Amino acid sequence: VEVLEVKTGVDSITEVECFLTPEMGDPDEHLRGFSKSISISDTFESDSPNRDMLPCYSVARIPLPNLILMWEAVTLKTEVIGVTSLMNVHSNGQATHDNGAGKPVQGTSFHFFSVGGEALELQGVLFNYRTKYPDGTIFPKNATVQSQVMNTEHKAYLDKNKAYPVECWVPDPTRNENTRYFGTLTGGENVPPVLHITNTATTVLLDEFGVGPLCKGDNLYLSAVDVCGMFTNRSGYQQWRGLSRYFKVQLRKRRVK
Amino acid sequence: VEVLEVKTGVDSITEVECFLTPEMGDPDEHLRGFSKSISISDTFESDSPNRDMLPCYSVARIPLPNLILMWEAVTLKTEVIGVTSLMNVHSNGQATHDNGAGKPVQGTSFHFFSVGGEALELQGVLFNYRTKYPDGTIFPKNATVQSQVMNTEHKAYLDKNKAYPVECWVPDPTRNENTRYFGTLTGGENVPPVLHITNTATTVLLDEFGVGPLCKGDNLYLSAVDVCGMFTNRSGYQQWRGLSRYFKVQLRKRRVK
Amino acid sequence: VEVLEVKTGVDSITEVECFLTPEMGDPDEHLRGFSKSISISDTFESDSPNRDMLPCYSVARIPLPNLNILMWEAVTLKTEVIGVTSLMNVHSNGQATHDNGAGKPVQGTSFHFFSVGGEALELQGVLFNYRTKYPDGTIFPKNATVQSQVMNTEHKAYLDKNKAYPVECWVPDPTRNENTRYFGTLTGGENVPPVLHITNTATTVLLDEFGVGPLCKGDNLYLSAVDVCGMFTNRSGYQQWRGLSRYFKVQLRKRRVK
Amino acid sequence: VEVLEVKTGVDSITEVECFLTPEMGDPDEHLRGFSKSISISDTFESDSPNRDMLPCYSVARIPLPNLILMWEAVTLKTEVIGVTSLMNVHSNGQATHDNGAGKPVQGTSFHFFSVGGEALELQGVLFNYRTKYPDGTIFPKNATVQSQVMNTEHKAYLDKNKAYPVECWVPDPTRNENTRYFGTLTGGENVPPVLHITNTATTVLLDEFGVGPLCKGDNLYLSAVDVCGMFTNRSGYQQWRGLSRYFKVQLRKRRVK
């Protein structure tokens, strides 16, 4: 694909605005946004996580106005929605000490977002290659011990919700030329969430050539993970807690040959 | 609104200077700036926080000189007032160890401020959709399990003091075009307050087009939350502690069509 | 004050260099730089801290060469905390971190603050607990009410005396201080580690958005500081604030005003 | 060699893309990416770590198109592969409290990468000069007590994979004129991993004279260490855990005398 000039005129720009809800596992009708309580297998060999215990990547395919011209994604505004909810330290929590408030959501977090002109490309990496992934999830197949470091057989597209567990897939750095992705994993059982909100921050999506993601077949792909940490119940059982992510993307028409 | 030229001359500028007091709950006549001690529900179903246990958003609607021209907010200086009061570790606190000083205010904090030409627009997000919020508060209504992640029915305006609880409302990123907002949630029961003060820092409120918040009906809206963390008393009970926030806003007259 | 041109020539510039010592309470003849051990009241209403237990703001009023009305304008500042390495003494009546271990170093809540102005720093009182009874010899918010816990505009003062204004009840008043530049950081928490940077290569410019620095009324420069580094914990677990001196070097130039 | 002009035009640029797998010790057929559990010696004199307990530097030598012209390395994109695998807190782990999730990978980390026109040059520094290093590793020889601080006899080239223990060797700052290297050691038993991923960040490899690494013999040398921390099993045994590193390097032909 050869990239030519940007179109101008009022008609030449468009915006997409939406939110992606988290997919933390939702273990019952009351627990949307939470995983099932986390349990620990006795050995690597016996690791067989329940589906509702595994957070998944979120994805949305957004149809754009029908258009050779392509929509080019230029800027992104994004934020995590509902950061203050984590101030509820009075709901079935475990007191930090005698008479204390509830232990807040804390521990390992993964905050990730991407904007692309096609589905996010994934590479599988397993903590433990013998983990048995549950029916209903899409996971690295034919895993070997090399899957614990790098097995190039594990290639996928983020093309379905509630399907791709966070713990076994990452953005494939060898691909994704037509996507911009950003993530941070903060590990450790006591790490505190640090969540910033503002409507004043824009990320520019253009590459070093001044070209943003180009939307193949007039579709924009948005992906997210916002595992904020773990909620600890009074019993001490812990569940992942996630929040939704807002996206606002500006796009312009670009001619290509 | 189509935006035209800025008015110049001596008459063309004005200043708003004020402070917003925190609304932490004020459980008795000696505890302005604190919440009621936090207690924890037995279950998710039975979460029923009392009003004096819930910090709320602060808001001031400031009338501007009567003026088609509109006042445009251009710059902000802001500061948390009384940061050193958190050095009082000698006042019914809980000794950190035998013979030690009192445990200082620490734990989950939310520091938030916004400047707008109209009320801050809020989206509701609930940690637990089954929480019964108390009489005298304004809270997400007709909550469903989906309210734990994103229920678009929960839209409100920050239009009343000591009413909108921090934990169930955030700025609505889908709206707020005429407001600039900034916030940080730092979670974890042991996080240290880190509070900077200076009279040398200015925030510019202009958007990417060089336009600040435009004050409809000649009112400026200022909003804040400064939950600094929790105070732990001698018996281990914990209360939110908040502080006031200073605002100084420079405004100029702007013609609109 | 209408601010006119800057004077030039050899005679037109001057320097102020000094250190301000901390005022932590100094409970005896051997404990300069420390507070008395901290004790805790059993109720808010019985919080009666002793004077030697309360860190205070430090202030220095520095006479400048005597001076159409010309005023000395403060333009740049170099500053740093003096004696940072002293906190490496972990062998001196400290509480061992664990069996056979070294002494716990100074740590916990810090307040690091400095200001340069052409008049006394202006203060606003805010109280953690309005019923705290501050001791004789300190200058404290008077006629305190429960509103003093968040904002009571009656509590206005000038930082105009050393060893007198307790840190915990006063802050720079953001509604005033047009003729001062101030900078402070509170880091709270009992386990917080001191992070103290030193260098002779860092300068802070004191000019405001209009290119004007503090103008020294009556040819006096006002320097203020607090450097509570944390608490020292002794063998028995008693804790005392520990403070350090602060170095100031300020460059000034002559400025005509109308 | 005098460095002359860059060649421009059709085949004057080339690109190298690969991943380096971690060499953490791999104590059995199921544990690629992990070390053997760490044992502690009784005294300094008796320190004798087994080969499979010692992470090693990784290196790859990449042949470039055959070319006086030399390939010049100009830019690097790099990232750690499989960051999300650290969210597996459900297998063979040690609960962080009664009924809690498993303790995530945490503690001492070393993240390091280099790009050069020849092998990374190493200087040996030993924590304990009396450590008996195992057969099959390449370590500072003829160690003396000075080796604990600086013994200039300890020079090596990172010229073999799975051979040079991380704890024995650092990049030699007195050499490496023709390499760019970057590393961070984060110590402490409880430090949280903080791992950022993005395809939008580039490192420029040019020195202050605008010259990048020049590839002798048309070979590019890539080196890495990514010890992310330690995994703790149910019984408290701890093992280093490493992850692969992606490299994409852009190169240009440079004329030299």
Added chain:
Amino acid sequence: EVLEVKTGVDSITEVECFLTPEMGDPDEHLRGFSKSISISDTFESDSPNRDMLPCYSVARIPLPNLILMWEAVTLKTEVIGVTSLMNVHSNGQATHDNGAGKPVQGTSFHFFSVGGEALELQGVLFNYRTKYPDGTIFPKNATVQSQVMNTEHKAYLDKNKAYPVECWVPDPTRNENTRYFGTLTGGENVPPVLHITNTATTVLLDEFGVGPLCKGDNLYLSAVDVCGMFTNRSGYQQWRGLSRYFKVQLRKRRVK
């Protein structure tokens, strides 16, 4: 008076070297470590042994014989041997049952200076009644005012293994001809955070474009790199230090 920079081939030189740490070296096997730290019963009985006190390191480097003076312009510097702190298998105290050894952690001081003369020091004491040992150079005639500021305590960093870190800091009222940088990170659980790269340069020129000017053709390099404490199996703790690399570029400058 500082005049113009000399140019041409012969007008630049570079200095490269390492400074070894001076942590106390309590025996023939423990270079880079202090003696185990012990704690006095009271302030008035504080009497640290020599081998328990880390000291400032200093090197005076002779430059090519040259009024011209060598001017130090840039610096590249890093801590050498950062990865050695990954030895958690050597007589350490297990973090928990069956765990690895606790790594080096706790209070650190990382400091370096480049000057055209000895670094000037000001003394400040944690406890003025500390009895400092024979073989160290320490603030003399100490009073309670030495705990905050006693201008009597002035010295030059003119000897290795002599000036204890805890007694002395760079004197900010002097050092016109030196550039110095240091960070104290306190607290007993503080994790070392150590960066290495050959791509970072510090410019030594002041606001007037003038770097340290080397009196008598000597360059002065000083360092402290106390990385933290190593805890042994029995809980005893010792300071651990590491060497520091310096690369300095100098140019000939005419002075009056």
